[PDB]
Amino acid sequence: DLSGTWYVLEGDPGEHLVVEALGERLSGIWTSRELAEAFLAHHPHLGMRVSALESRALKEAYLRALGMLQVEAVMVDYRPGTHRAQVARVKDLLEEVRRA
Amino acid sequence: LSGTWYVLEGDPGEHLVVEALGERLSGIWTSRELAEAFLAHHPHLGMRVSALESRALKEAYLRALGMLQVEAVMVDYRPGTHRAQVARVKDLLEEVR
Ligand SMILES: [Cl-]
Numbered sequence: 001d002l003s004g005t006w007y008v009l010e011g012d013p014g015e016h017l018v019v020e021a022l023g024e025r026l027s028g029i030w031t032s033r034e035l036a037e038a039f040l041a042h043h044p045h046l047g048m049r050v051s052a053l054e055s056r057a058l059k060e061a062y063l064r065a066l067g068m069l070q071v072e073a074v075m076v077d078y079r080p081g082t083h084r085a086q087v088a089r090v091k092d093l094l095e096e097v098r099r100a
Numbered sequence: 101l102s103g104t105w106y107v108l109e110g111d112p113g114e115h116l117v118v119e120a121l122g123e124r125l126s127g128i129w130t131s132r133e134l135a136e137a138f139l140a141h142h143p144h145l146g147m148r149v150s151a152l153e154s155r156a157l158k159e160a161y162l163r164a165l166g167m168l169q170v171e172a173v174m175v176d177y178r179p180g181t182h183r184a185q186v187a188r189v190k191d192l193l194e195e196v197r
Contacts (some may be wrong), residue, residue: 011120012119015120017118017120018118018119019116019117019118019119020109020114020116020117020118021110021114021116021147022145022146023110023111023114023146037197039178042172042179043179043186044180044181045174045177045178045181045184046118046120046121047120047121048120053118053147059179067120075144078144079140079145080140080142081143081144085143085144097168
C-alpha cells in the first residue's frame with residue numbers, strides 16, 4: 001500500500017531521480033527507509049539521498065514536481081526482485097494521495 | 101575505451117538514461133562481466149547487453165545519445181566504488197571519429 005511515508009531519492013532540493021526505461025520517464029517511491037537506502041546503496045555517485053515524504057502536503061508536492069519533470073509513472077519498491085515490477089501512473093497516484 | 105563497448109539496449113534507441121548530478125547520463129561498460137552483472141541487478145527494465153565492436157557501431161550509439169541530449173556516460177559503473185568514471189559523449193564521439 002502507498003499509505004504511510006513515501007521514501008524517494010533526491011539530490012539538490014527538487015532534483016529527483018528520473019530514469020528512462022520501458023519507453024517512459026520513471027521515478028521511484030519506496031515504502032520504507034530501508035528499501036530506499038538499500039536501493040541507494042546499490043547506486044552511488046549519483047549525488048542522491050533518501051528523502052521522506054511524511055505528510056499529504058509533501059507527497060502532493062512530490063507528484064506535482066514529477067509533473068514538472070514530465071514523469072508519468074513511478075516504480076514502487078523497486079529492487080532486484082522476482083515479481084513483475086510495480087509501476088504506478090502519476091495520474092493514478094494524484095488520486096490516491098487524496099486518501100491521505 | 102579502446103576495446104569493445106558493452107551497452108544496454110531496450111526499445112530501439114532506448115538506452116538506460118538517468119537524470120542525476122547536473123545532466124542526463126547513460127552507461128558504457130568495458131567488461132561484458134560488469135555489464136551483465138549490472139543488468140542482472142536491474143530486472144524489469146526490458147534491457148539487454150549488446151556489444152559494440154565497430155568504430156561505426158560506437159558512433160551510431162553516441163549519436164543516438166547525443167540526440168537524446170545525453171552529454172555523458174558512466175564507464176564501468178557498479179556498487180562499491182570510491183568514485184565513478186564519467187566521459188563526455190562529445191569527447192568519446194570525437195575520439196571514435
Ligand atoms: Cl554521491
